[PDB]
Design a binder for these strands. Structure first.
Lengths: 96, 70, 172, 242, 95
RNA sequence: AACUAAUCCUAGCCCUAGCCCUACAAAUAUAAUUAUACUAUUAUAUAAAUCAAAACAUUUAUAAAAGUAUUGGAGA
RNA sequence: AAUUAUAUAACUUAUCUAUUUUAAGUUUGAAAUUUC
């Protein structure tokens, strides 16, 4: 909140965080996993991998079809700016 | 001593044509080795009553030349 | 760059948090008057904490302002202020502000200014009086408290009489 | 330990490495080259031979330059090589007399000079020697352009030279506005100093300014990896089509 | 302009050394200084009229600051290049 | 064979050689380490003296020629 | 004291400025030299 003149506190509803709680009913993921469960080989997601998984198929299909142009790069998922999204990747404007 | 003016206050490179002097605007902070940038008026994007200033009486739309003595 | 303690927007005669805003330019033509002889009333002779001499509250016409008090200035007195330089001398009463051309030779004066338009800088202390040593046409000789006898134009304003605490020099 | 290169070579290494190497070759040559200012207060020995003390025989000679101080105000003015001489004097020009601390002041002045190239009259600090040089130079504009930096002894004059050189280089219509015919005459009159625009920009630039300017030239916004992958993906796909 | 010369000879350093200055080597002799002299002559043409030193457009030789402080300062004189020298003197033929 | 005590060998260092160098979060210059406006913002003079001249005053270093000539209260 | 004292500072003359027809003197003294 913000303290106004005379040192009087005025709570700002916007600046007070709202806890968004997921619905855990019916969710099979729990604090622990069985020792029975084998571990998976780590494959961290990266910009190249994300581009390959999501962006590459769209461009590949369009390029073969010939319907690819620089103007439509945003169609494949490019964001010229992060402004306007509740969660902005850069500059980071959201709490975890 | 009577002072004309409030007693409180009392106890080249740019002109050159063809080039523009470099300034610390890129630095985003003052550095002694760079020239002072020219700063245009700042736009907050919203109106703040705390920093809002009431306009002079004459600029008011309700301004009337005749004086009303209240 | 220091925040001024004289932070009052408008000149006032009420004590200011007290300090009273004094005016050392005696003849400021007040509202509804021509730049000619006008009269003011000495409402009260109070003491200024920030000045050695006691200040006389001079109220005339539509404007009220504090000023330094002369030797005999007291509450309820009527004080005249004239800018007109008459061919003949203008009647002089103790403490009145007139051009040195108006003043007659030999009158004790105070709150004099070395240069026309400079404003009062001398004889503002208690018990200090400047003698109008000589007067000719537009020139007059004023003996300032520094012992420097200086010649100034008649445009300079002189207030008749000695400053308050007349016997300050006679203190033993 | 001991440094492989002496301290003086540290400056050389810094110039030879980093953004300094990336600086324009023309500007680097101007910085690297050093030209001695014209002697004004001292003369080199006329004869190349003198008597050696120990052997009492004729020997080769050396020159001792007199110390002359050029204040930064000269860099903000146009001084014709004159400067303040700080040191000691012997009164009456005899060694037998007293030694007096003396500061020798050349007569300094502030004067206005007309520039044809800039079509403006500039009021600047100047000395009498500069005024004679301007007349000898066949014009104030000639003096700024003809005189080298050291002989000119003025950062503002070099800055004026930078503006004049760029004005000549670009054939900018800013010269003598509304008088195109007069503009050509000035360019023709000072045609000798026409140079490439890139060189003219860097004439007289300070080292700190040059480094920042080069940094500004080479600074480029980060590439969105989406675009980079788009270009890479298209190139590979285009190659595959072949 | 001021001209000075070292009083004391400094020992020669040779092909590849610098002589080491000392206190007596730091004393200098004034061979000539314009300050002590009266102003030296300077060549100037006239852009306006001055009393009894000629009239606008003529070429006059006057002591340096005397001409500068009086003539050039008021605008009476200007610096004389050869090109404007002929032009200014030519104007006198027309004057 | 006694109490107090004592015993030990590496912690590391030193000098040359070689080599130059170009390698968490959060908070912070405001009052540093104070999560957001205030208030514009900033180092560096001959190096001196001490010291030597038995004091002190000009002065007093910091490959061969050669510690020679020269310089110096011709003295350190 | 005796002898001085172009540390500076002033004036005068230069200087430097207006118009127009720091140096050298001297003085103060930062001081210096010698003695009582």
């Amino acid at each position: 909140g913000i303290y106004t003149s005379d040192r009087k506190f005025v709570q700002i509803k916007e600046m007070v965080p709202e806890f968004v709680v997921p619905d855990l009913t019916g969710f099979k993921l729990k604090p622990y996993v069985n020792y029975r469960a084998p571990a998976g080989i780590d494959t961290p997601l990266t910009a190249k991998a994300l581009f390959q998984e999501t962006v590459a198929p769209a461009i590949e299909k369009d390029f073969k079809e010939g319907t690819f142009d620089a103007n439509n790069l945003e169609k494949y998922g490019f964001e010229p700016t992060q402004e306007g999204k509740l969660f902005q990747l850069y500059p980071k404007n959201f709490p975890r | 001593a009577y002072e004309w003016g409030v007693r409180s206050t009392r106890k080249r490179v740019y002109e050159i044509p063809g080039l523009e002097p470099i300034t610390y605007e890129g630095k985003k902070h003052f550095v002694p080795w760079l020239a002072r940038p020219i700063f245009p008026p700042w736009e907050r994007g919203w109106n703040d009553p705390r920093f809002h200033r009431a306009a002079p009486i004459h600029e008011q739309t309700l301004y009337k030349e005749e004086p009303c003595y209240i | 760059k220091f925040v001024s303690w004289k932070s009052r927007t408008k000149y006032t005669v009420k004590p200011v948090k007290n300090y009273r805003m004094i005016d050392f330019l005696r003849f400021r033509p007040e509202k509804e008057k021509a730049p000619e002889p006008f009269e003011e009333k000495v409402v009260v002779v109070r003491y200024d904490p920030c000045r050695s001499a006691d200040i006389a509250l001079v109220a005339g016409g539509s404007r009220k302002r504090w000023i330094i008090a002369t030797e005999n200035m007291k509450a309820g007195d009527t004080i005249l202020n004239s800018n007109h330089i008459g061919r003949m001398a203008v009647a002089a009463q103790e403490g009145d502000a007139h051009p040195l051309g108006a003043l007659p030779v030999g009158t004790l004066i105070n709150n004099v200014e070395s240069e026309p338009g400079r404003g009062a800088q001398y004889i503002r202390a208690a018990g200090t009086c400047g003698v109008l040593l000589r007067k000719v046409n537009g020139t007059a000789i004023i003996q300032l408290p520094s012992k420097r006898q200086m010649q100034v134009l008649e445009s300079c304003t002189a207030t008749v009489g000695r400053v308050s605490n007349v016997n300050h020099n006679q203190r033993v | 330990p001991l440094h492989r290169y002496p301290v003086h070579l540290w400056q050389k290494l810094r110039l030879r490495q980093g953004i300094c190497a990336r600086l324009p070759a023309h500007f680097l040559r101007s910085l690297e080259e050093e030209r001695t200012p014209t002697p004004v207060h001292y003369k080199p020995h006329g004869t190349k031979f003198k008597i050696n003390p120990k052997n009492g025989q004729r020997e080769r000679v050396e020159d001792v330059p007199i110390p002359v101080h050029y204040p930064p105000e000269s860099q903000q003015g146009l001084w014709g090589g004159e400067g303040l001489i700080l040191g000691y004097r012997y009164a009456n020009n005899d060694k037998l007399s007293k030694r007096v601390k003396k500061v020798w002041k050349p007569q300094l002045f502030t004067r206005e000079l007309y520039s044809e190239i800039l079509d403006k009259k500039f009021t600047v600090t100047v000395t009498m020697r500069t005024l004679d040089l301007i007349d000898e130079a066949y014009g104030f504009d000639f003096y700024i352009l003809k005189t080298p930096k050291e002989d000119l002894g003025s950062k503002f004059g070099m800055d004026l030279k930078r503006g004049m050189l760029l004005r000549l280089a670009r054939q900018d219509p800013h010269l003598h506005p509304e008088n195109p015919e007069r503009r050509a005459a000035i360019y023709d009159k000072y045609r000798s100093f026409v140079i490439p625009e890139a060189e003219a920009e860097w004439v007289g630039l300070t080292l700190e300014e040059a480094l920042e300017k080069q940094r500004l030239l080479e600074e480029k916004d980060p590439v969105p990896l989406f675009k980079v992958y788009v270009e890479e993906l298209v190139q590979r796909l285009q190659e595959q089509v072949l | 302009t001021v001209i000075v010369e070292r009083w004391w000879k400094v020992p020669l350093a040779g092909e590849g050394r610098k002589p080491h200055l000392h206190r007596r080597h730091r004393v200098y002799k004034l061979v000539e200084d314009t300050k002590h002299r009266p102003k030296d002559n300077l060549e100037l043409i006239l852009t306006q009229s001055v009393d009894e030193i000629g009239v606008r457009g003529d070429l006059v030789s006057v002591k340096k600051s005397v001409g500068r402080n009086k003539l050039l300062s008021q605008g009476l004189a200007v610096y004389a290049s050869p090109e404007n020298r002929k032009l200014f003197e030519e104007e006198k033929s027309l004057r």
